Amino acid sequence: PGSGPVFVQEPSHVMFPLDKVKLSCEVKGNPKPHIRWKLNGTDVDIGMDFRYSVVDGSLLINNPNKTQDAGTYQCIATNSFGTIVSREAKLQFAYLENFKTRTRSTVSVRRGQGMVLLCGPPPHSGELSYAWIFNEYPSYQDNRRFVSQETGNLYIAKVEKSDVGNYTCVVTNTVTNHKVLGPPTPLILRNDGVMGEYEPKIEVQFPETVPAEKGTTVKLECFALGNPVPTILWRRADGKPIARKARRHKSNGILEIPNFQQEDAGSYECVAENSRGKNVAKGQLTFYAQPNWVQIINDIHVAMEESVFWECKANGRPKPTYRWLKNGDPLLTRDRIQIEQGTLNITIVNLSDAGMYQCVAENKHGVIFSSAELSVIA
Ligand SMILES: *[C@@H]1O[C@H](CO)[C@@H](O)[C@H](O)[C@H]1NC(C)=O
Ligand SMILES: *[C@@H]1O[C@H](CO)[C@@H](O)[C@H](O)[C@H]1NC(C)=O
Ligand SMILES: *[C@H]1O[C@H](CO)[C@@H](O)[C@H](O)[C@H]1NC(C)=O
Ligand SMILES: *[C@H]1O[C@H](CO)[C@@H](O)[C@H](O)[C@H]1NC(C)=O
Numbered sequence: 001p002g003s004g005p006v007f008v009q010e011p012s013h014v015m016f017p018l019d020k021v022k023l024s025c026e027v028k029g030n031p032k033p034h035i036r037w038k039l040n041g042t043d044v045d046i047g048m049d050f051r052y053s054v055v056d057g058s059l060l061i062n063n064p065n066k067t068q069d070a071g072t073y074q075c076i077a078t079n080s081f082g083t084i085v086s087r088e089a090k091l092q093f094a095y096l097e098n099f100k101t102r103t104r105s106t107v108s109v110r111r112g113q114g115m116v117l118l119c120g121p122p123p124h125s126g127e128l129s130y131a132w133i134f135n136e137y138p139s140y141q142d143n144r145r146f147v148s149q150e151t152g153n154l155y156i157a158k159v160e161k162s163d164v165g166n167y168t169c170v171v172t173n174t175v176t177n178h179k180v181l182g183p184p185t186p187l188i189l190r191n192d193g194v195m196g197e198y199e200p201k202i203e204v205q206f207p208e209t210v211p212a213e214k215g216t217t218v219k220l221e222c223f224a225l226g227n228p229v230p231t232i233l234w235r236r237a238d239g240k241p242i243a244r245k246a247r248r249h250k251s252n253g254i255l256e257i258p259n260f261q262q263e264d265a266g267s268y269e270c271v272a273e274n275s276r277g278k279n280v281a282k283g284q285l286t287f288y289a290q291p292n293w294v295q296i297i298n299d300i301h302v303a304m305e306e307s308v309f310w311e312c313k314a315n316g317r318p319k320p321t322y323r324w325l326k327n328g329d330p331l332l333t334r335d336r337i338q339i340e341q342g343t344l345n346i347t348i349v350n351l352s353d354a355g356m357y358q359c360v361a362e363n364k365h366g367v368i369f370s371s372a373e374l375s376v377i378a
Pocket of ligand 1: 039040067068069070071
């Protein structure tokens with residue numbers, strides 16, 4: 001009996017469909033701690049007004065609207081012995097608007113030429129998925145036709161007499177699962193002559209720097225226009241073998257690296273080749289990791305006039321940075337409070353010091369919170 005608040009469950013980032021929403025957060029402690037919420041930093045008045053339902057800490061919003069709920073939430077729990085704030089949870093809303101036109105100018109191409117048909121997704125939020133339709137049926141993907149999942153563009157390495165007709169981009173919001181269709185774009189062949197042969201020209205490629213988060217699947221795209229139609233090949237610019245766990249898809253337009261690790265980082269190249277020559281694209285897969293607790297602060301009891309020492313340690317990439325909190329408020333160094341980075345030092349203690357403390361570790365990729373109680377003995 002007699003304990004400050006500790007989190008049993010904290011709020012998580014959310015991408016919510018606009019077609020309910022629960023922000024989980026539960027606390028234990030004695031006395032039973034009261035829970036409050038903060039949007040962008042301002043206390044949310046739950047009893048008034050909405051249909052907010054704070055069920056056991058967890059905030060419910062029973063009918064959402066983007067324009068007024070488009071920020072980051074924080075759950076704060078308080079009892080007699082002090083206050084702890086939870087990690088920040090970003091609340092975003094997903095949607096995909098319709099195209100605002102039903103037809104499109106025809107494009108006229110020389111047979112043998114490479115070409116790009118641009119999707120041009122409508123305003124949206126959340127991750128998108130893409131496919132194309134050709135003359136009423138799904139457009140076939142291969143060596144010569146590549147659809148980018150980053151942009152939705154359709155690439156034809158080499159236009160052939162079989163390619164004449166209508167092309168439609170079908171955009172899909174992967175989180176809401178709604179789809180919208182673009183305007184058909186008519187493709188016709190020039191009758192003025194044909195395009196001869198030329199060396200590959202890479203038109204879709206991974207960026208010059210591609211941040212790769214630890215433990216995720218990194219996907220690289222590479223595809224070239226050319227005549228004859230190029231072959232694609234992947235290799236590392238420092239001669240290191242690509243991992244055996246790496247797979248290739250879509251006639252080698254895509255290199256997947258599952259469960260990314262430090263050893264997989266480095267300069268990657270894709271090579272486009274045909275009989276007329278070769279083209280090389282390169283980029284740097286740069287490894288990064290959100291903070292993770294190595295050493296956390298823990299509850300501490302001390303006698304009235306004695307000293308205390310706390311240290312926080314977090315791994316991550318870049319290396320994490322440290323700030324401190326007392327009872328939910330920014331705590332900076334004074335007397336007898338000496339705080340340097342991940343260290344807190346109280347030279348002599350008084351009843352005033354007893355309370356909840358928090359070490360926060362952050363890098364440009366993430367923040368993490370830890371909390372402990374400091375009780376002082378009569
Ligand atoms: C919170 O801030 C973001 C911009 O930083 C804004 O988009 C959002 O609407 C804000 N939340 C509200 C509704 O006050
Ligand atoms: C595409 O379809 C339209 C009808 O929607 C048709 O008139 C036209 O012949 C087709 N375009 C081409 C380039 O063949
Ligand atoms: C939220 O605000 C927008 C306009 O700012 C409006 O279109 C929508 O109907 C509103 N929804 C609610 C629940 O108030
Ligand atoms: C921290 O406490 C004080 C600074 O407030 C310092 O004199 C002392 O040596 C430090 N303690 C340790 C063990 O780091």
